[PDB]
């Protein structure tokens, strides 16, 4: 409708009117990650507490769920392979650029001491599950019937859990008291243990190979051909498990049915 | 076609077809029968209204066929995302359900506004039934008029309003006021004679709604109800169909224009959806997100409420309107095409102009008496005043003291009647004042004497002689006078003075005036002594050789606030066009007066008379006057009235039937004017509803005028007209800055989601927040808009083009969108990116994001600092990237009304707080806003959360840059009128 000559006049106009404001968004975003330093994060108002995953993880709906059989090898390999590809990176092969940890106490690491300027992360490689590292045992407990749970902690710059005792797992069910034993679960490392030379979090670049703590929750006293359901709850001072918006931070929730 | 054949029946074939007699009437028996048989003699009032199809009716129109379609889309894409398990379908069920609820909320609230109005519309109508002097079995008795049937006997007196259609069988000095039917402000006489075949020109014939001024009838009802000429136009005026309002094209306009946008930009964003390697099904759903985003789910609720406000100011003047969209539409008006008699006019004899001490003095003619009176020192005007108050047999209905004269209710004759108000306005106290002057003789007027005149005795005891007062036609008295009252003398009626009486007579006759002659004699005492026995038969006074008193002159002259309201119509821009249904020669004489002919405009006729040539031979080029009479105006055509209209500016219709006002309204509707009519009788109910805009008189309008009319004047103030144009260009004007204020932030809420569908990153604006944006944080800012007063003299221009000045154009509506919108989606982005960095993700990192970032199997998700995070916590982090995002659009809002304040004027010249509603909104804008983001428990209920103050700072410079950019768009406009920077950037 309007001139030709117009036309290209008009979007010349809008052309350079995009243009000039990309321009003032581009010099945005150039101050902005500017303003910003790469080894803390400014506020972290989200991550109060922290989250918790499990292994393997497998869900159905409505959260965790994890049914297998015992006699069909083919209901827990793939989760027996979960595990194997995951400690993959727990190997002693891919994880020697870190140091021998015995420090016993948090590790802070107050000057950037490591080949071009990084950081020096403990070490955390398979071996120290002990039975449910992978061996002797590739089955990690589900051929058994006493599965290797690995429970693992979200990582947060400059996180303390605790100073008085280390931050430990407590499993056990909800709603099953009046028929039948309570569980018995044994942890590896031994009474499900983080070591506290494992914190703080310096970040993805101070730290680039650290490797979160692991404890395995090998399961003994879990009834056959019966619906389940178990919490792993972090005991620390500075942990809140349960908060109804996140069933996620301090627990893992899932529904257990091994069957034969 | 039963009437067109009863005028012109004789009186036994009457008597046959109706089974009656002429003497005795209908039996009381038939006369039941036939009531059964034909119905209520009344007029059927609209029945078709069932109470819930009034409010169905509410739920159509321009934004709500978009928001229903809206609605309807947000459906079908439901069902789809739930069949491929989308969850959060939620949002879905949210948005179409308050799509409909506005739609409801701002129907229902539509509804209780126009009942409002039937309401107050029935509250000034008189509901005491009319009676009728019938006579049945021979026996004159009183009853309900919607009790005659027809071939029923009625009777008739002056003051009787006349029940049927009546065929006159006898009559004695009797005349009518024909005004609803015709235009025709002069009584029109009845007589039994058939006068011509169309029962409209007829003598013998009494229409049902009008009123007996005078003398008395008698005759035949011939149609009772809607078969009269009262029904038949009334069943007309309802067939007539009402074209669609202005303001309701213009919104049904820009919702061609959403749509057109709309659809557009859900199409190429389908089709690049697609080639993203997204699914055919996902891709469409992402279409019909963009169309339905492209909807202002608030707009709807906006402008109803910006077009009550203005309702209630129009009604607050005692104007009243019986749909919103009514208030616009006089702004719009190009044209008036306006009846003569009850709406410019009175309709009320007047006393316009006196002829004494050889002089014409002019008398005031107005209802509230604002304006100049006469001359009232003379003698020989006391001896006048004397003669028409003591010559006088009319009366004032008991109890009217309070009530203006003009306005009281008299027991009298047509010309009776408006001399008893001139003295009453005159002398004072008439009546008494005349029992003070008791009254020996009385001859009343007849043919046989030709005048009226009574013998008094005088006031004082120390006066005993007699004074006769006599009044009558000018020539009538000319001949029965010897002398004449001139400067407190008594002079000799010669030559000189007959010859000046008489051209002073024609003077007011050329006026279309009903002039009177008055004179007076005194009886000595000698002759006539106290107890003199005057007999009229035989001549013992003198009824010759009297003293002329004067001449006195009436007229139907024009209501108060008239004239000066057609002055300002017309500096406007409005053409103004009279149809009156009266004869040309007052119809012109009126039109000059008020102001539709100018001082020195001239038609072919008043030009061929100063150049004395046949008036074919002047040129009608030159002529700016033209009249138009129905003969006339039946044997042109479209083409020759189109010339006739776009020749002569200021015209004229005179003897116009209520077909033909409609069918000038239609050539000028046609001619792609907006017409307005204006009306009182129902003569106009026809032009009425064919106009854009039917103005009734809520006082001396018709129940058929006042039905087909969309607007009301319930103080029949004809300067409320004038207030209308203005308000209703106001609120145009505030609506083109509404419309855009509210349009604009629609683009800063749709791309966040679409290049949360291209680049993928967590959603940055939430479906529920938007929602609280459109319905709830920015409707008061914008209803303020409604405030705004003019940035020009919005009373000297011209009505808008309706095809160039648009509510919204593609120059306004590109603009605000793609210009405007697109710097408060870039504040949004940076607040975006920022509240993201500062909580850990990177620019860079957000791009691609989305699916791990949705997706409920990871709880250990990675930020660019390595950290770990749960969903629920990204989810309150998206949650933050909302508010973040919202107030990013708040402080561009509080930008964008100051913005839109003024379309042409510099903030800093009319000033920034000038609007004190839009401040308390602004201010409520703010509160709320907070309210939302730190109240206890809003991350829950709502997608809201307390946000660090480092981010609302974020913004506001994008906010001063807007600003500053339309700001300069108006400087530059302002002191630059060139057309480059205008059309480009102007709205
Ligand atoms: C501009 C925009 N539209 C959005 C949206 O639209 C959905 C739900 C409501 O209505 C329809 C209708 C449709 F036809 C198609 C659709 F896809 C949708 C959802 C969200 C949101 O809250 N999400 C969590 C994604 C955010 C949005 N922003
Ligand atoms: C752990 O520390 C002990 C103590 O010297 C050392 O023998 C061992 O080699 C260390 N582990 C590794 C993997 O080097
Ligand atoms: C762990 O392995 C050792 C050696 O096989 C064994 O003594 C111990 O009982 C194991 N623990 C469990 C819970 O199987
Ligand atoms: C376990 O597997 C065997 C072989 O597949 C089958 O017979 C048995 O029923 C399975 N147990 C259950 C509870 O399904
Ligand atoms: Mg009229
Ligand atoms: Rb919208
Ligand atoms: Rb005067
Ligand atoms: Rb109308």
């Known amino acids: 409708g309007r001139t030709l000559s117009r036309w290209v006049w008009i979007s010349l106009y809008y052309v350079a009117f995009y243009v000039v404001m990309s321009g003032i968004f581009a010099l945005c975003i150039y101050v902005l990650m500017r303003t910003i330093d790469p080894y803390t994060p400014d506020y972290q108002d989200q991550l109060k507490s922290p989250g918790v ?47 021998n940890c015995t420090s016993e106490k948090y590790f802070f690491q107050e000057s950037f001491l490591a080949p071009n300027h990084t950081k020096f992360s403990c070490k955390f490689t398979a071996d120290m599950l002990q039975n449910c590292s992978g061996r002797p045992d590739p089955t990690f407990g589900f051929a058994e019937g006493k599965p290797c749970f690995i429970i693992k902690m979200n990582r947060i710059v400059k996180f303390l859990p605790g100073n008085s005792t280390a931050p430990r797992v407590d499993c056990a069910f909800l709603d099953q008291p009046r028929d039948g034993p309570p569980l018995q679960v044994e942890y590896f490392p031994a009474n499900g243990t983080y070591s506290l030379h494992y914190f703080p979090y310096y970040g993805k670049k101070a730290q680039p190979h650290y490797s979160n703590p692991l404890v395995a929750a090998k399961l003994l006293n879990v009834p056959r051909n019966r619906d389940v359901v178990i919490v792993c709850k972090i005991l620390a001072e500075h942990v809140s498990f349960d908060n109804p918006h996140d069933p996620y931070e301090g627990k893992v929730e899932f529904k257990l049915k091994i069957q034969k | 076609e039963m009437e067109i054949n009863d005028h012109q029946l004789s009186v036994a074939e009457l008597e046959q077809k109706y089974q009656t007699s002429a003497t005795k009437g209908l039996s009381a028996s038939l006369a039941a029968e036939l009531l059964l048989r034909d119905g209520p003699n009344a007029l059927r009032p609209p029945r078709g209204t ?50 409909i ?158 749509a057109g946008l709309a659809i557009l930009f859900g199409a190429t964003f389908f089709i690049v959806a697609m080639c993203i390697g997204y699914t055919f099904l996902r891709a469409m759903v992402f279409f019909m997100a963009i169309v339905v985003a492209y909807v202002p789910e608030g707009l709807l609720a906006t402008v109803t409420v910006c077009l009550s406000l203005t309702a209630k100011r129009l009604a607050s003047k005692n104007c009243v309107v019986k749909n919103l969209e009514a208030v616009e539409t006089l702004g719009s008006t190009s044209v008036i095409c306006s009846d003569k008699t009850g709406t410019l006019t009175q309709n009320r004899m007047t006393v316009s102009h006196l002829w004494f001490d050889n002089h014409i003095h002019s008398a005031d003619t107005t209802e509230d008496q604002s304006g100049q009176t006469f001359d009232q020192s003379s003698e020989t005007w006391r001896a006048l005043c004397r003669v028409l108050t003591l010559c006088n047999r009319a009366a004032f209905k008991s109890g009217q003291d309070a009530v203006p004269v003009p306005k009281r209710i008299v027991i009298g004759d047509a010309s009776e009647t408006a001399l008893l108000k001139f003295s009453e306005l005159t002398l004072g106290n008439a009546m008494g004042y005349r029992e003070r002057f008791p009254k020996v003789c009385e ?55 007959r010859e000046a009486f008489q051209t ?170 907006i017409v307005a009519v204006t009306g009182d009788g129902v003569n106009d109910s026809p032009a009425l509803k064919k106009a854009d805009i039917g103005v009734a008189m809520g006082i001396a309008g018709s129940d058929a005028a006042k039905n087909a009319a969309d607007m009301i004047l319930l103080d029949d103030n004809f300067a409320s007209i004038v207030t209308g144009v203005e308000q209703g260009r106001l609120i145009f004007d505030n609506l083109k800055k509404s419309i855009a204020y509210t349009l604009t932030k629609n683009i800063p809420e749709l791309t966040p989601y679409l290049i949360y569908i291209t680049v993928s990153v967590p959603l940055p604006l939430g479906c529920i927040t938007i929602l609280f944006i459109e319905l709830c944080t920015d ?128 903030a800093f010249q009319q000033g920034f707080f000038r609007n004190r509603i839009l401040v308390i909104a602004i201010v409520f804008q703010v509160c709320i806003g907070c309210f939302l983001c730190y109240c206890p428990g809003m991350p829950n209920i709502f997608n809201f959360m307390p946000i660090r103050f480092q981010w609302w700072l974020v913004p506001m410079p994008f906010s001063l840059l807007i600003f500053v950019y339309d700001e300069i768009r108006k400087l530059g406009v302002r002191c630059c009128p060139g057309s480059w920077w205008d059309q480009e950037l102007y709205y």
């Open chain 1, 53 to 99: 995953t499990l292994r393997p993880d497998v869900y159905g709906e409505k959260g965790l769920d994890i049914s297998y059989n015992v006699s069909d090898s083919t209901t827990w390999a793939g989760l027996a392979h979960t595990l194997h590809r995951f400690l993959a990176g727990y190997s002693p092969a891919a994880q020697e650029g870190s140091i």
């Open chain 2, 50 to 99: 069932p109470e819930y199809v009034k409010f169905a009716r509410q739920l159509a129109g321009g934004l709500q066929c978009l928001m229903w379609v809206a609605a309807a889309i947000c459906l079908i894409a439901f069902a789809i995302q739930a069949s491929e398990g989308d969850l959060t379908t939620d949002d879905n069920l949210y948005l179409a359900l308050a799509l």
């Open chain 2, 443 to 497: 001859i009343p007027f007849n043919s046989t004497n030709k005048f009226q005149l009574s013998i008094h005795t005088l006031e004082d005891p120390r006066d005993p002689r007699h004074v006769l007062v006599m009044k009558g036609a000018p020539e009538r008295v000319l001949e029965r006078c010897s002398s004449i009252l001139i400067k407190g003398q008594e002079l000799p009626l010669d030559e000189q003075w």
């Open chain 2, 101 to 258: 609820a506005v739609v409801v909320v701002t129907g229902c609230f539509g509804y209780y506004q126009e009942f409002k109005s039937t309401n107050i519309i029935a509250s000034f109508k008189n509901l005491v039934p009319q009676q009728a002097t019938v006579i049945r079995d021979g026996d004159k008795f009183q009853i309900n008029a919607d009790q005659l049937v027809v071939g029923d006997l009625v009777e008739m007196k002056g003051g009787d309003r006349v029940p049927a259609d009546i065929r006159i069988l006898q009559a004695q000095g009797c005349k009518v006021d024909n005004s609803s039917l015709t235009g025709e402000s002069e009584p029109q006489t009845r007589s039994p004679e058939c006068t011509h075949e169309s029962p409209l020109e007829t003598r013998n014939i009494a229409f049902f709604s009008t009123m007996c001024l005078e003398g008395t009838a008698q005759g035949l009802v011939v149609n009772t109800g809607d078969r009269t000429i009262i029904g038949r136009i009334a069943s007309l005026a309802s067939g007539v169909e009402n074209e669609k309002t202005p303001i309701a094209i213009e919104i049904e306009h820009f919702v061609d224009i959403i």
């Open chain 2, 504 to 673: 002073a007579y024609l003077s007011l006759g050329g006026l279309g005036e009903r002039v009177l002659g008055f004179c007076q004699l005194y009886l000595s005492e000698k002759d006539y002594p106290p107890g003199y026995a005057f007999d009229v038969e035989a001549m013992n006074f003198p009824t010759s050789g009297l003293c002329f008193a004067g001449l006195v002159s009436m007229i139907d002259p024009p209501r108060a606030t008239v004239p000066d309201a057609v002055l300002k119509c017309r500096t406007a821009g409005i053409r103004v066009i009279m149809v009156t249904g009266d004869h040309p020669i007052t119809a012109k004489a009126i039109a000059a007066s008020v102001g539709i002919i100018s001082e020195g405009s001239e038609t072919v006729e008043d030009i061929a008379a100063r150049l004395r040539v046949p008036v074919d031979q002047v040129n009608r080029k030159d002529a700016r006057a033209c009249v138009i009479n129905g003969m006339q105006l039946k044997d042109m055509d479209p083409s020759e009235l189109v010339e006739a209209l776009r020749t002569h500016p200021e015209m004229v219709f005179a003897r116009t039937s209520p077909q033909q006002k409609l069918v000038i309204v239609e050539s000028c509707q046609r001619l792609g004017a």
């Open chain 2, 779 to 906: 409707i008061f800012p914008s209803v303020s808009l409604a405030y705004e007063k003019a940035e020009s003299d919005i009373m000297h221009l011209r009505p808008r083009n309706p095809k160039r000045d648009r509510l919204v154009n593609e120059p306004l509506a590109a603009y605000s969108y793609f210009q405007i919108g697109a710097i408060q989606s870039f504040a949004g982005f940076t607040d975006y990116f920022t509240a993201m960095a500062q909580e850990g993700w990177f620019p860079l990192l957000c791009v691609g994001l989305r699916p791990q970032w949705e997706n409920h199997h990871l709880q250990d998700l990675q930020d660019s600092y390595g950290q770990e995070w749960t969903f629920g916590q990204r989810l309150y982090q998206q949650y933050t990237c909302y508010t973040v995002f919202f107030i990013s659009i708040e402080m561009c809002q509080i930008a964008d009304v100051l913005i839109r304040k003024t379309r042409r004027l510099s």
